[PDB]
DNA sequence: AAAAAAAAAAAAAAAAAAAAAAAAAAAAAAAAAAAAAAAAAAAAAAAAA
DNA sequence: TTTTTTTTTTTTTTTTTTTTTTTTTTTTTTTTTTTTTTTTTTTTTTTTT
């Protein structure tokens, strides 16, 4: 038992600046966590700083969100990218927007898609595509339409300010985060 | 005997942050493990952290479930994906939903299935299909119907909250986890 | 002599986490190995961890069973699958259940079997079939009836709890393990 | 001379785990090799591990048998199957039991045999048949009677425990091993 | 000159395990080669391992026999079978024993022989027959009597232990090896 | 010019083991080639290995004989058999000994010979006969007497050790080799 | 034009070993081609190897003879036999020597000759006869005397070493080659 | 149109070696075709190789002769013999020389000629005779005198070197070729 | 309808080389068919090659002559001979020239002609005679004079180059072709 | 019924080239059959080719003439000659022209006619005579005058181009065809 | 009854460099093998420009 | 620029046996180089029961 306590104390002392920065950023921010127990907020900042993911706004790697008076540590859509890059096994990641009259055919069985880029008749988007390929040959491609993204936003999202000014960025972020979370390979320790 | 103790101590010291993160996440969670022996919970967290599978909720790789006052470490449906990707011998993994009037014929002997996608008469699903192919030519395909999935859920599952709002996700997860567990090739050490 | 000792020590040090995981899982389990010599259990865990086959329950690759106060390391019905996949020469493996009024004829000399699937008059099973085919053209097919499986279970099996709730799974597992052990090609090192 | 020593050392270092597993299995077994020179046992384990044929009991590929105080490495009836499959030129191998009133005629010159299967008057066996066919058209068929098998067992076998409980398995194993050893084509390196 | 040296070195390095196995088997055997030059034994093992014919006792493909203080590599009666099967042009090979009152007539010009099998008056053998047929229509048949085999054994063989317990096996082996050596078609590289 | 050099180099690299085996067998043999230029011996071994005819003693397909200080590659009496079998157009080849009081008449114009076999008055040979028949109907028969064979041996052969112990084998070999060389159809590439 | 070049290159690559063997045999031979252009020798070896007729001495199918400083490819008296056998339409070919007091009468119009064989008064030859018969009924017979053969040898032959030791063989070869060249039917591709 | 092109291409590819041999023989020959268009020479070699009649000098079946700067393919006096033998309907062909005081009478109406052979008074020739007989009873006989042959040679032949050394061979060749061309039955495809 | 198309296609494919040879000979010839439709020329070559009558100049069996811009296939005076010989019912065919003072009398009713050959007073020809006799006894004889032949040549022939140098050959050819065409029996398929 | 269909199909397949030649000749000809049903033309060509009588113009054995929009197969004046010769019972056939002052008397009862040939006073024809005699003694003679032939031509013939340039040939053809058709003996199968 | 007829003459061919051998043969009979511990679940998501 | 949810297991233990035998032989080549020549000629008519 004392050995685990000493190891935990050493780990805690090794990562003081991240904890200090997270606490200072939380203090300097707005006042929306005043209805929750401070112990939960401290624990959330602790676990966030343990994973080398500060809570500073300029990076957007993690957040603290209160649920029923309890603070929860949450991962952003760039934390998955950070973990995937820390894994060190990826080769390519990309996500683009398919406009009107670009794709030719697409079947979900063989995951084969063909497009005719730089040949458009209008200036409105029709769908979005994402694709990531590893080093050992594994590849994955997904394609979403506007209706599915709208349904997902209506079902899950509970805000409308961000989705109004820039519709494309939120859709791209959702596609990227879903593709990376569901099928990606993640790791914690950098190699 | 002392050599094995030194090796075990070195292995323990090498993976402290995962153990710390798992313990902190368990502490910050709800109070449902208070009726079990803490030693079993500590051992379960230990073995979970040994396999590079943290117990944090944002990843969903493993769980701790108490059975008859004894805590047990359990693998999720993404842990199999993680192990398969760590193996480094796969080429493709996929699972889709076959809607009404899509498939033509299917026999379980030769595992040959043909479908006519993008040609539907209704908007209700009829079945689910899964398919994974390796690099050395080995392929595997499975097909489930709604009745079999309903029977499996009635026989094994003991909850109904998740199965109500989104029926398709649970069926896809069950098909994927069964196909990967029964016939897949798994490994622990990354290559 | 010293060179072999150094090589053995290096091999031992290379595979510490598997040994640690196996020992922890054995400790966390029930108390049924207390009537045997601990040295035999340690040796069995050692050889099990040497072959990249952990003893964790969630995988079911190997077991430790005591016989006359001596612990023995045993291979499950998925260890054969793992070794066959590690070989890298297979093309297809399958096992199905032949119901009432499905097969037409079957002779054990030429190993030729014909069936009329999706055309049944009842809902009771009559037999089981297994078939595996390699890449270089070698194929093997076996067919068992209910009477033979019942006789085998009565002769060899010494438990009845598992065979009661689900009769089909045990029969399929027995057919698969027998077909893979008697006629399959196995290997230890992954290619 | 130094070049051959370096090559031998490299070959030895390449196959350490098989040697370790064989030695551990020999140690964990019963005490029947204590009347022989340990150097011979070490050499036998060495040559057994050189051919990718471990000595573990669960596989039954090879054995170590002491003769006049000297240990000898011996091939089982599955080692021939393993070598034949490693050759990669086979198409079919089979062995069955001919019961009472099944075969019609059989001549040893043209190796032509005809049978009327699934038409029996009793439940006692009369003989055994074996047949293996290659890819380039070469085929071989053998047929043994009960008297010849009994004479062979009396002449060569020196134990009776195995032959009592299950008479058919030993006869089938003898037919298979004799047919594969005398007329089969074997190889060491996998292709 | 350097190119041939590099090619020879590559060929030597490609076939190390066979050489190692042959040397280990020679070392583990009895002490009868101590009166000969070790260089000749090494060269004989080298050429034996070059032709993919190990010197292990369990296979019986080749031997090393000392003549006037010089070791010589020799082919067994199964090496001819191995080479003939490696050729890939054969269709059938067989050898049987003709008992008393079985054959009717036999002339050595047209090589036509007729027999009445399964009709015997005694239980003593009278002669032996061998027959091999290729794919392109070429066939060859030979027939030996007891007197000729006895004369050959007296003239050439210099041992009597093997010929005493089992007279038929040695005669069959001699007929097979003579028929395959004198008239058969052999090859070294497998096709 | 470079293309022919590349083709020759590829052909040389394709047939290394035969060259290595021939050189090793020549080295392990007696010392009778020490009075000749090594370049001629190397060239002779090269051409011998090019035709898939190794120089090993156990086969007796080809020899190296020095003439006036120059080594020459020579074909044995089995090389003709090998080439004829490689041709793939033959149907039957045979050679027998005609004893006293067996043949009735023989004329060299129509090549018609009749004999009364199995009816002899003495045990001394009188002549030898050879006969080979193709598939397209072409047949050839030759008959030699003792006087002609003795004259040929006196005129051409320059040794007497072999001809003393076994007179019949040398006569049969001479008849076979002459009949196959003068009138047979030969080919190099196997079909 | 490129198509014919590709076809010629493929034909050249298909027959490399014959060209290599011919070149090696020419190199290993005596030095009598040093006064001619090497290009002509290379072309002659090329055309000789194109017709599946190697230039090796042990076969005697073709030769290279220099005329006025130009090498020429020439057919031997066995090349005609090889081509005739490749045709596949022959039934019988023969040539014999008619001794003193054997023939009775012979007219060149109807090509009818009668002889009384095995009835001689001396041991000196008087003439030679040749006869070949096809399958469709066509037959041809020729008869030469000693004077005509002597005149032909004096007129055409320019050497005397071969004609001295063995007079009969050269006469038989001349009769055979003339009869086969003037009236025979030849072909290049084997059927 | 494409079908005929494919058939022509297949026919061309089937007969490459004859074309290659003809071209190589033409290249290796003297320089007398340098004043003609190469396309005509290529076409002539093509048609010559199409009819299974190579242009090699050792056979003398066909020639290429330039006329007014245009190369022409020409048939020799042995090509007619080859075609007649390919027909498969002939029974006998012959041509002889009638010397002084041999024939008795000859009339051109009934084609009846009688001679008294082996009864001569001088050693000078007087005429030539040719005779060919089919299988169905058709026969043809021709007889030429010296004056007619001399007139034909003066009228048609434009060279004198060949006609000087050997007068009889040219006359026999002319008689044979005229008799076979004017009245013979020819065919292209062998039967 | 499809059956006749398949049969026609098979017949076309069976006779490709004749068509190819005819087309190549037509191409290599002079330019006199450039004023006609190529389809007619192709059809004429097709029908000419269908009847096993190539259009090569060295044989002179058939020709292509343009009439009013339309190519026509025409039979020569040797095609009738070829067809008559293919019939297989003829016994004798002949045509001679009757000189001055040879014939005695000739009447056209009974077709009886008598001549006194080898008794001439001048060296000028007076007429021509032709005679052909079958096997079943049918005979036919015709006799032409110089005036009738001159009248026929003036009426029908439209060229004078051939008729100038050799007057007898054209007259003999006309007599032969007229006698064979008007009264002969012809057939297409060889028997 | 199926047997007759198979026999008809075999007969059709046996005579393809004649049908092909007839169709090609009809196609290459002029356009005068375009007003008739193609089925009738095909049937007429079929029956014409069935009787071994091609429709090619160079032979003139048969024709196709349209009558009231229906094509009809017609026999020429040489088809009767062909059938009569196929019968094999004839001995002589002839037809001549009787000029002015040649015949003496002629009565139609006894069919006796006498003429004084080679004794004429003018150069104009007066009549025509025809005569054919069999082997068994049967003879037939007919005699026509100019008036009867003119009346027949006026009554039956409907063209005048042919009858103008050559009056004698048409009269001879009419006499021959009438005499052969009315009184001759005809057959279809050759004997 | 639809039948009259022709485009045909000819050559470039003689011949040889083949006789032959170094092969007789053996070290091989066979065994240690029968099979079991297996069924399954905890999962749906979002905070971003 | 905005804050959730859900549930807890089960079974069972082994046996069998050990070897043998024996070693070689044979020897050596030959011979010789070529030739000859180059074309021609000409194109449609007719009908229907």
Determine the 3-state secondary structure of H92 from DSSP: strand
The residue of G186, G190, G191 whose CB has the most chain H CBs within 10 angstroms, and thus the best one to mutate to test that interface, is: G186
Classify burial at B167, counting beta carbons within 10 Å of its beta carbon; exposed 0-12, middle 13-18, buried 19 or more.
middle
Q: What backbone torsions phi and psi does residue F78 show, to the nearest 5 degrees?
A: -100, -20
Length of chain G, in residues? 191
CA distances from H49 to G114, G181, H13 (A): 43, 20, 12
The gap between the terminal CA atoms of chain F, to the nearest Å, is 30
E134 touches strand K (CB under 7 A): no
DSSP one-letter code for D72: E
Distance F57 CA to L26 C1' (A): 15
Nucleotide nearest to H173 (CA to C1'): K13
Element (H, E) at J115: strand J112-115
Classify burial at C184, counting beta carbons within 10 Å of its beta carbon; exposed 0-12, middle 13-18, buried 19 or more.
buried
Pairs of CB atoms within 8 A across A/B: 65
DSSP one-letter code for F110: T
The whole-angstrom separation of Cα F25 and Cα E44 is 9
Determine the 3-state secondary structure of G10 from DSSP: helix
**Each residue of E55-78: b (16+ CB within 10 Å) or e?**
bbeebebbebebeeeebbbebbbb
**Each residue of G121-142: b (16+ CB within 10 Å) or e?**
eeeeeebbbbbbebeeebebeb
The whole-angstrom separation of Cα C94 and Cα C172 is 10
Q: Which residues contact B187 (CB under 8 A, 6 or more apart)?
A: B83, B86, B87, B88, C52
H155 touches strand K (CB under 7 A): no
Name B residues 101-120 whose Cβ lies under 7 Å from strand K: none
Judge whether H100 is closer than 8 Å to chain I, CB to CB: no
Q: Are D66 and D33 in contact (CB under 8 A)?
A: yes
G166 touches strand L (CB under 7 A): no
Rounded to the nearest 10 degrees, how much is the dihedral formed by the CA atoms of H51, H55, H57, H61?
30
Judge whether D40 is closer than 8 Å to chain C, CB to CB: no
In angstroms, how far is CA H124 from the centroid of its own chain? 26
Q: Rg for chain A (alpha carbons), in Å?
A: 21
Name A residues 164-183 whose Cβ lies under 7 Å from strand K: 165-166, 169-170, 173-174, 177-178, 181
Asked if the Cβ–Cβ distance from A183 to B81 is below 8 Å, we say: yes
Q: Are J102 and J93 in contact (CB under 8 A)?
A: no
Judge whether J25 is closer than 8 Å to chain I, CB to CB: yes
Element (H, E) at D139: strand D139-145
CA distances from C40 to B48, C33, D41, I128 (A): 26, 10, 21, 122
Q: Are I24 and H50 in contact (CB under 8 A)?
A: yes
The whole-angstrom separation of Cα H119 and Cα H101 is 8
CA angle D87, D89, D95 (to 5 degrees): 95
Judge whether E8 is closer than 8 Å to chain F, CB to CB: yes
The whole-angstrom separation of Cα H91 and Cα C85 is 72
Asked if the Cβ–Cβ distance from G17 to F50 is below 8 Å, we say: yes
CA distances from G155 to G148, G186, H96 (A): 10, 27, 21
Q: Which of I78, I60, I58 is nearest to H73 (CA)?
A: I58
DSSP symbols for chain B: -HHHHHHHHHHHHHTHHHHHHHHHHHHHS-S--TTS-HHHHHHHHHHHHHTT----TTT--EEEEEETTEEEEEE-TTHHHHHHHHHT-EEEEEEEEEETT-EEEEETTTTEEEE-TT--SSS-EEEEEEEEEESSS-EEEEEEEHHHHHHHHHHH----HHHHH-HHHHHHHHHHHHHHHHH----SS--
Q: Which of D133, D145, D135 is nearest to D171 (CA)?
A: D145
> What strand order describes the sheet that includes I90-99?
I90-99, I125-134, I139-145
Name G residues 122-141 whose Cβ lies under 7 Å from strand K: none
Reading phi first (left if > 0) and then psi (alpha if -120 to 50, else beta), residue D12 is in alpha
Look up the protein residue whose alpha carbon has the minimum distance to the C1' of L32: G159
Q: At what angle do helices B146-156 and B167-183 cross, to 10 degrees?
A: 80
Distance C169 CA to L8 C1' (A): 23
Asked if the Cβ–Cβ distance from E24 to D50 is below 8 Å, we say: yes
Q: At what angle do helices A79-87 and A167-183 cross, to 10 degrees?
A: 40
Element (H, E) at A173: helix A167-183
Do the bridges between strand B139-145 and strand D112-115 make them parallel or antiparallel, or are there none, so unpaired?
Answer: unpaired
Spell out the domain ranges in chain E.
2-75, 79-183
CA distances from H56 to G183, H22, H62 (A): 18, 6, 8
Q: Which nucleotides of K are covered by protein (CB under 7 A)?
A: 1-49
Asked if the Cβ–Cβ distance from D187 to E52 is below 8 Å, we say: yes
Judge whether D92 is closer than 8 Å to chain C, CB to CB: yes
Residues of chain H neighbouring G186 (CB-CB closer than 8 A): 59, 82
Q: At what angle do helices F146-156 and F167-183 cross, to 10 degrees?
A: 80
The whole-angstrom separation of Cα J191 and Cα J84 is 11
Q: Which residues contact I26 (CB under 8 A, 6 or more apart)?
A: I33, I41, I45, I55, I64
Q: Which residues pair with I140 in a beta bridge?
A: I132
Rounded to the nearest 10 degrees, how much is the dihedral formed by the CA atoms of J61, J67, J70, J71?
10
Judge whether E47 is closer than 8 Å to chain F, CB to CB: yes
Judge whether H104 is closer than 8 Å to chain I, CB to CB: no
The whole-angstrom separation of Cα E136 and Cα D34 is 58
Distance G26 CA to K21 C1' (A): 22
Give the torsion sign (CA, J140, J145, J148, J154): positive
Give the torsion sign (CA, H160, H166, H168, H172): negative
Q: Rg for chain D (alpha carbons), in Å?
A: 21
Q: Are F123 and F162 in contact (CB under 8 A)?
A: no
Residue B125 to chain A, least CA–CA distance (Å): 15
Nucleotide nearest to H156 (CA to C1'): K11
CA distances from B125 to A148, B98, E113, F72 (A): 17, 6, 74, 83
Asked if the Cβ–Cβ distance from A111 to B90 is below 8 Å, we say: no
Helices and strands (DSSP H and E) totals, chain G: 7, 7
Residues of chain H neighbouring G51 (CB-CB closer than 8 A): 17, 21
Q: Which residues pair with F71 in a beta bridge?
A: F66
Q: Which residues pair with C145 in a beta bridge?
A: C127
Give the torsion sign (CA, B54, B55, B61, B67): positive
D157 touches strand K (CB under 7 A): yes
Residue E6 to chain F, least CA–CA distance (Å): 11
Element (H, E) at G13: helix G2-14
In angstroms, how far is CA G172 from the centroid of its own chain? 11
Q: What backbone torsions phi and psi does residue H24 show, to the nearest 5 degrees?
A: -65, -40
Residues of chain J neighbouring I109 (CB-CB closer than 8 A): 94, 96, 115, 117, 129, 131
Determine the 3-state secondary structure of E10 from DSSP: helix
Structure solved via: cryo-EM
The whole-angstrom separation of Cα B142 and Cα F15 is 49
The whole-angstrom separation of Cα H57 and Cα E11 is 47
The whole-angstrom separation of Cα H112 and Cα E142 is 60
The whole-angstrom separation of Cα E20 and Cα H168 is 77
The residue of F138, F139, F186 whose CB has the most chain G CBs within 10 angstroms, and thus the best one to mutate to test that interface, is: F138
Q: Which residues contact I44 (CB under 8 A, 6 or more apart)?
A: I64, I71, I72, I73, J28
Rounded to the nearest 10 degrees, how much is the dihedral formed by the CA atoms of B79, B84, B86, B91?
-140
Q: Are J65 and J78 in contact (CB under 8 A)?
A: no
Nearest CA in chain G to H88: G136
| Subunits close to F (at least 3 CB pairs below 8 A) | E, G
The whole-angstrom separation of Cα F110 and Cα I29 is 52
Judge whether B46 is closer than 8 Å to chain C, CB to CB: yes
How many C-beta atoms surround the C-beta of residue I41 within 10 A?
Answer: 18
Q: Which of E53, A141, H154 is nearest to D187 (CA)?
A: E53
The whole-angstrom separation of Cα E151 and Cα E167 is 14
> What strand order describes the sheet that includes E90-99?
E90-99, E125-134, E139-145
Q: Are B138 and C91 in contact (CB under 8 A)?
A: yes
Residue among B7, B40, B139 whose CB faces C16 most closely: B7
CA distances from C152 to C95, C171, D171 (A): 18, 10, 19
Judge whether E161 is closer than 8 Å to chain D, CB to CB: no
C161 touches strand L (CB under 7 A): yes
Resolution in angstrom units: 3.4
Reading phi first (left if > 0) and then psi (alpha if -120 to 50, else beta), residue D46 is in alpha
């Amino acid at each position: 038992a004392p050995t685990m306590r000493k190891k935990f104390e050493k780990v805690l002392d090794k990562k003081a600046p991240q904890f200090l920065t997270s606490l200072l950023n939380l203090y300097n921010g707005d006042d929306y966590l005043q209805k929750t127990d401070p112990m939960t907020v401290v624990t959330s900042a602790m676990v966030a700083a343990t994973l080398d993911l500060p809570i500073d706004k300029n990076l957007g790697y993690a957040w603290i969100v209160p649920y029923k008076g309890r603070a929860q540590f949450q991962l952003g859509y760039k934390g998955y990218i950070q973990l995937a890059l820390r894994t060190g096994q990826y080769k390519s990641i990309n996500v683009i927007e398919v406009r009107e009259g670009e794709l030719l055919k697409w079947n979900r069985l063989t995951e084969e898609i063909e497009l005719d880029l730089d040949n458009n008749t209008s200036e409105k988007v029709v769908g979005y595509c994402g694709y990531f390929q590893l080093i050992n040959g594994f590849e994955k491609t997904v394609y979403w339409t506007r209706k599915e993204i709208e349904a997902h936003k209506q079902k899950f999202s509970k805000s409308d300010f961000g989705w109004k000014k820039d519709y494309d960025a939120m859709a791209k972020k959702t596609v990227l985060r879903n593709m990376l979370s569901k099928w990606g390979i993640l790791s914690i320790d950098m190699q």
